[PDB]
Design a protein around this ligand. Structure first.
Ligand SMILES: CC(C)(C)C#Cc1ccccc1-c1ccc2nc(N)ccc2c1
Length: 371
C-alpha cells in the first residue's frame, strides 16, 4: 500500500490528521483521525481558527437530513447540522462513498488555534455516535458500499512535526518488525480492551486487575496521554517516583501541573522505567505484553522541557498516542480484535526498545472486565 504510506501529518500534540475530500466537486479538508469517537464532523462556517471549511452550497451531491446534533464535552461543545455527501480519501483507497456528515456551525474549545485541521473522523462504532446509534459512522459506510476490507491500521510516529500512516483496508508489513499479537475487542462501541497486568520496570503493580479496566480501557488516537483510573495512576506514579530516584522532581510535575527542564542533549532516559501493559490474549489463559519507553511518556513541549504524559481519568484507561506511538496498531474490525506490533518508526535509544512479547499465562482474564 505505498499509496497510503505517510498520509498523516500533525503537530505535537494536536493529534493526527488525514487529507479528505467532501462534495462534488471535491472540497479538500484536513480531518483528525480519532478512534475514540464515531462522528464524521467538519467545520462548515468561517471560524477564525480554520484554514478552510465545508461549503455545502458548492456541492450538488449534498443532501440535508434536517436534523441537528449537539455534542457537549467536559467543558466546551460542538454543534452542527446533519447531512450526507460524497467522501473520498486521496491518499487512501480509490473509491468515493456517501457518508453522514455533521456540518459544525457552533463550537466552543473544539478547534485548536494554530492547528491545521478542520474536522474529525470518528473511526469507532455506532453505539457511541451522537445523537444515537442509527447514525452510521464513516467506516461502516466504506465497508458497506465498496469491497474495502473491514479493517484499518495505524502507525503514529513520534516526531511539531509528527507524521504517520493510516492504511485503510489492510496491513503494510514494512511498517512493523516482529509479529502482531491480538487482543480481542470486548465490545464494539469504543475499541474497548482488557488489561490484565501492569508492570513498571518488570515489577508488578499487584492490583486486582478489575481496577485497570474501570470502568473501561480503550485504544484512542484522539487522546495524547496515557490516562489511568486514579487508583491505578496513584499506584503507578508512586512506583515510577520510586524507580526514578537518581534525580528528584517537584510534586506538581507528576500531576502534570508543571513542566520539567534539562539542557539540550542531556536528558537521562535511564533514570526512567519502562512501562508494561499486559493485554488479554486471543486464547483462554493466554496474554501478551506491550512495553513502552520514557521517550513515549515523557514528551517534549517546545514552548528542553518535557511533560509527564501519564495522567488520571474517571473515564477509564485511555491508551493514547503515548502507547500508540510505539506500535503498529491493527484495528481488525472483521475479527473483533486489535493487533499490536513494534512500530518500525518508533523513537528509541540504543539500550532499550519498545516490545511486543508473548505468550504469557494469565488466569481469570475475563474477570478483569467491568460490568
Ligand atoms: C480532540 C479534542 C481533545 C481537541 C477535542 C474535543 C471536543 C470538544 C467539544 C466536544 C467534543 C470534543 C471531542 C471530540 C472527539 C474526541 N475524541 C477523543 N478521542 C477524545 C476527546 C474528544 C473530544
Amino acid at each position: 500500500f505505498v499509496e497510503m504510506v505517510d498520509n498523516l501529518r500533525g503537530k505535537s500534540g494536536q493529534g493526527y490528521y488525514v487529507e479528505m475530500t467532501v462534495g462534488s466537486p471535491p472540497q479538500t479538508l484536513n480531518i483528525l483521525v480519532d478512534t475514540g469517537s464515531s462522528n464524521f464532523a467538519v467545520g462548515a462556517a468561517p471560524h477564525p481558527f480554520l484554514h478552510r471549511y465545508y461549503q455545502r452550497q458548492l456541492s450538488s451531491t449534498y443532501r440535508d437530513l434536517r436534523k441537528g446534533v449537539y455534542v457537549p464535552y467536559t467543558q466546551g461543545k460542538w454543534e452542527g447540522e446533519l447531512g450526507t455527501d460524497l467522501v473520498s480519501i486521496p491518499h487512501g483507497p480509490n473509491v468515493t462513498v456517501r457518508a453522514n456528515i455533521a456540518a459544525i456551525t457552533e463550537s466552543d474549545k473544539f478547534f485548536i488555534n494554530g492547528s491545521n485541521w478542520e474536522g474529525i473522523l470518528g473511526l469507532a462504532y455506532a453505539e457511541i455516535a451522537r445523537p444515537d446509534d442509527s447514525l452510521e459512522p464513516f467506516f461502516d459506510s466504506l465497508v458497506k458500499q465498496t469491497h474495502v476490507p473491514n479493517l484499518f491500521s495505524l502507525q503514529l510516529c513520534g516526531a511539531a512535526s509528527v507524521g504517520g500512516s493510516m492504511i485503510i483496508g489492510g496491513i503494510d508489513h514494512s511498517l512493523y518488525t516482529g509479529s502482531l499479537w491480538y487482543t480481542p475487542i470486548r465490545r464494539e462501541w469504543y475499541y474497548e480492551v482488557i488489561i490484565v497486568r501492569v508492570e513498571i520496570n518488570g515489577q508488578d503493580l499487584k492490583m486486582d486487575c478489575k481496577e485497570y479496566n474501570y470502568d473501561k480501557s480503550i485504544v484512542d488516537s484522539g487522546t495524547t496521554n496515557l490516562r489511568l483510573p486514579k487508583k491505578v495512576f496513584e499506584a503507578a506514579v508512586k512506583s515510577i517516583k520510586a524507580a526514578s530516584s537518581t534525580e528528584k522532581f517537584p510534586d506538581g510535575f507528576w500531576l502534570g501541573e508543571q513542566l520539567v527542564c534539562w539542557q539540550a542533549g542531556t536528558t537521562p532516559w535511564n533514570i526512567f522505567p519502562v512501562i508494561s501493559l499486559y493485554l488479554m490474549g486471543e486464547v483462554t489463559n493466554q496474554s501478551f505484553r506491550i512495553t513502552i519507553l520514557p521517550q513515549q511518556y515523557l514528551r517534549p513541549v517546545e514552548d528542553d522541557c518535557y511533560k509527564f504524559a501519564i495522567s488520571q481519568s474517571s473515564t477509564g484507561t485511555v491508551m493514547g498516542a503515548v502507547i500508540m506511538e510505539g506500535f503498529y496498531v491493527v484495528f481488525d474490525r472483521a475479527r473483533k480484535r486489535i493487533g499490536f506490533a513494534v512500530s518500525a518508526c518508533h523513537v528509541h535509544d540504543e539500550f532499550r526498545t519498545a516490545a511486543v512479547e508473548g505468550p504469557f499465562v494469565t488466569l481469570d482474564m475475563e474477570d478483569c472486565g467491568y460490568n
